[PDB]
């Protein structure tokens, strides 16, 4: 099923590791031109060795001022994948001001900032485009010790809908994908213990966690014109967790 | 908190046992006039003995024609509680035509028929009113062997919403209540295995099942003018089941 990403310029945040890195790889291989944004330069360095021709951009997206100086000069971007996030887990009664702030600055405020930059350029060129926000299964279902993280993702699902509403007349689509655990570093830091994992597994009808590949496939579908009448949506990649 | 039910005429379906029976008693105590509809006569005989003054109507609500003949002549009814239902549990691959038909005739078609009769009368008298549909936590979360039952409750939630929409201009509110397991006869036949109740109990934050009185409290709030701007909703009485 052609998806018409060959040739397009795509920006991916949090591309150094995990889902964002596999997204860059998938995109490169299909022919799109990629701008890889990430916090750690050594991740970008290896990625430009593996995926020749991408453009690396190293910046901490939690810093509004520094992001604007690094990204303002990126140029024409057709497609955008907002993937960077942090997961700072704390029981509710132990949540601190600093964990709150950092989590919201990276997981949500950055999503606004980068999206504005790409959406202003699409409008100025008068062309259509698409944005995918990587959310989570726990945007809609509570998990212990995840009150701050799950609130950013709950906020992100809603941000996705207002973006979709306000950007729809400029033919820019905006969608979220909501995966279950993925055994990236972020998932393995938390669900590596056979027992905690087990309690989640028993709730997943397909009886397994997601692979990076499942997530990328959903991302690529939502970026392509194949999903031309889908916007404001939250696409689950959670093996059926939300259904039961 | 005055909910001003005294003096109005309320119809309750499935009044012979469980939540419906508990609803009739609560209303009876508050001075409302109750029409009690149920399938089994002996259930209504003892109900009239404990709550003198209620009007019993004995009829099988799955029978459209008998219901019309039984209820067409019931008089001014201000408030309606659609509580009667059947739970015919079969694995999806064993669902039969008969279990399907019987479940939808009782759990949904009867809701339409009795609500039409009550809504027509209210509109003729030009007075406001309120309808509560008793739904379920399984209206939005799947449970094994409940494909038909959960579908009737999912249909009920949505019916509630269209009812709310069309009857809104006539000052009739329509809401649903969505309880977790309750240890009526309906709850005791399924969840009586200790290992059974355990699976679900661990997914309920308040760590217990619902009592009849919790459900009745919610029905009464939704019938009262205390909930005057609430229509088309599904109020969970499930100890937080839906939240995680
Ligand atoms: N893995 C799962 O269990 C899972 C489940 C549901 C949803 N998700 C979502 O999937 C997305 C990716 O997660 P993942 O598992 O791929 O995580 P990961 O393996 O930890 O990678 C996240 C990437 O984002 C980068 N990043 C984080 N904060 C940054 C910042 N302030 N500025 C620039 N880049 C930053 C990280 O860089 P550094 O490592 O250099 O900091 C890393 O390259 C997230 O939005 C996450 O919430 C993941
Ligand atoms: N108990 C639970 O765990 C639970 C959980 C979530 C939601 N709910 C909902 O709560 C409501 C009541 O449940 P419950 O536990 O109170 O059930 P129950 O104890 O079995 O009582 C149901 C009542 O409805 C009557 N009824 C059933 N079919 C009828 C028909 N065709 N015509 C006339 N009357 C009929 C029954 O009469 P007969 O017994 O004489 O047939 C009985 O009096 C239902 O809508 C049920 O789906 C119950
Ligand atoms: O809700 P998560 O922790 O499985 O992403
Ligand atoms: O009606 P249920 O969801 O308690 O089985
Ligand atoms: K997670
Ligand atoms: K049930």
Swiss-Prot record, chains A, B:
The modification Omega-N-methylarginine is found at residue 21. Pfam families: adh_short_C2 (PF13561). NADP(+) binds at residues 11-40, 153. It is an enzyme of class 1 (oxidoreductase). PROSITE patterns: ADH_SHORT (PS00061). It is linked to Pentosuria: An inborn error of metabolism characterized by excessive urinary excretion of L-xylulose. This is L-xylulose reductase. It comes from Homo sapiens (Human).
